[PDB]
């Protein structure tokens, strides 16, 4: 139940299976062994000055793309801190990302690469899924000829990543089931034979196609994506991938691609090992200096566009954005092996949230993007 090239399962979800294995004396090993030379290497690299760039660079070493896009995948892999209350009530740290933008980009490869690095996952198309196919169903076993219950797409993705491609092409009936999985990370089934609540602790990675040929900078974002504006606010990060014609970016991309048809970064093994180590041992906790900045940032974000709320030009800010900042600060702290979330983490989180939506080039009155200011 291990592989060098894939990540280790989340121990936060299998606590009692570990206890049962010891009571049953089965030596099936779930997590991998770490020698001390390799653990010394871990801190030797974790001390490096350019850790953040190096990690972002080694995520997908064959996708010439902005490092902001890759950093979101890197922080999605680490995940937020899972918190358990002793009076019932669970808070989880799963990150949800949307990749909107023109076609003819490398969004598709990101989803495939993330499918193949995460231990548990399922790949779904837009107009190829049903509610029954995502939740559960009853089937006839050709061996015993009786009726048994079988798991669905989202329940099989418990403690992993689920990749939904062409999210905008999906029916309102099928989009209905995702609300509960994005709110409470559960599913409630009341069908003939089963009345129970299931655990779906999964990360959502979705890509959407813009209306018409290309993204139109002259229109607002709410008019370019066929998705209700209220649904757009449930995602932690929204990535606008825009295409601009610029001669030195094109030159670099062409050389990059042609170099692959001939005959520093961290190899796959070391990357996965580092991520598993961090996800396994350390646990970050927030401080007051971070709380001040979090509250200030949320108030500042809400105060913006207070007048531009009746008209759906920009995406209105809600409490889920506050929770997104919390989650991203905790993930950035987990990277670099700290147990303390300082002010740098919150500043980086807010920087990333604004940079994803391209808020450094948007006119807050009309909702339009100046492409002369969108630099590669």
């Amino acid at each position: 139940k291990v592989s060098d090239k894939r990540l280790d399962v989340d121990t936060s979800t299998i606590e009692q299976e570990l206890m049962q294995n010891k009571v049953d004396h089965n030596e099936v090993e779930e997590v991998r062994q770490i020698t001390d030379q390799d653990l010394a290497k871990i801190r030797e690299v974790a001390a490096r000055e350019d850790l953040y760039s190096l990690l972002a660079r080694s995520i997908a070493p064959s996708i010439y793309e902005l490092e902001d896009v890759k950093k979101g995948i890197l922080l999605q892999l680490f995940g937020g801190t899972n918190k358990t209350f002793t009076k019932g009530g669970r808070y989880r740290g799963d990150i949800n990302i949307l990749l909107c933008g023109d076609p003819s980009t490398s969004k598709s490869q990101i989803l495939q690469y993330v499918h193949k690095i995460t231990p548990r996952g399922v790949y779904t198309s837009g107009k190829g899924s049903s509610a029954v196919g995502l939740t559960a169903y009853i089937t006839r076993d050709v061996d015993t000829k009786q009726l048994v219950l079988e798991s669905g797409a989202l329940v099989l993705s418990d403690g992993g990543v689920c990749c939904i491609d062409e999210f905008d092409k999906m029916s309102d009936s099928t989009r209905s089931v995702l609300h509960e999985v994005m709110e409470q990370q559960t599913i409630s089934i009341a069908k003939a034979g089963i009345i129970t609540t299931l655990n779906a602790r999964s990360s959502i990675l979705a890509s959407a196609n813009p209306i018409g040929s290309r993204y139109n900078p002259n229109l607002p974002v709410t008019e370019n994506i066929d998705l209700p504006p209220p649904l757009l606010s449930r995602f932690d990060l929204v990535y606008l991938v825009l295409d601009k014609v610029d001669e030195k970016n094109d030159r670099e991309l062409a050389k990059h691609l042609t170099n692959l048809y001939l005959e520093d970064v961290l190899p796959v093994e070391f990357l996965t090992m580092y991520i598993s180590y961090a996800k396994e041992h350390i646990h970050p906790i927030i401080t007051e200096a971070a709380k001040t900045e979090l509250v200030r940032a949320y108030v500042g974000m809400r105060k913006m566009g207070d007048d531009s709320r009746s008209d759906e030009k920009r995406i209105t800010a809600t409490t889920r954005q506050l929770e997104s900042m919390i989650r991203l600060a905790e993930a950035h702290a987990k990277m670099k092996l700290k147990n303390v979330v300082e002010l740098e983490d919150v500043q980086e989180a807010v920087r990333l949230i604004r940079s994803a939506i391209k808020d450094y080039a948007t006119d807050p009155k009309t909702g339009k993007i100046d492409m002369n200011l969108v630099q590669t």
């Binding site: 139109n216 900078p217 002259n218 691609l257 042609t258 048809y261 492409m371």
Partner: protein, 104 residues
Amino acid sequence: IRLSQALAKLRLADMVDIDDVEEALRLVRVSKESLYQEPTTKIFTIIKKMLQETGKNTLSYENIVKTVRLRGFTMLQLSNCIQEYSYLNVWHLINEGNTLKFVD
């Protein structure tokens, strides 16, 4: 790249050549040549008529297309006109094809 690779495989070679890339470029260019199979001044006079009867230097491109179509023309004709007098430095098309601006 794929087309050049296909042509190389047809010669039974190991290296890819430049005459192979030229053949792929000629195919990609030839694919769309029926659209250019057949006015500049007459469309120019019409556009300058509707700039007057307005006042400013900006002019919506969607209205230009609609008005020119009702007169009776082809969309190739309009494209040839915009580019030609864009090189004579009379106007430029800005905002990704949304507005037309006359330089002074």
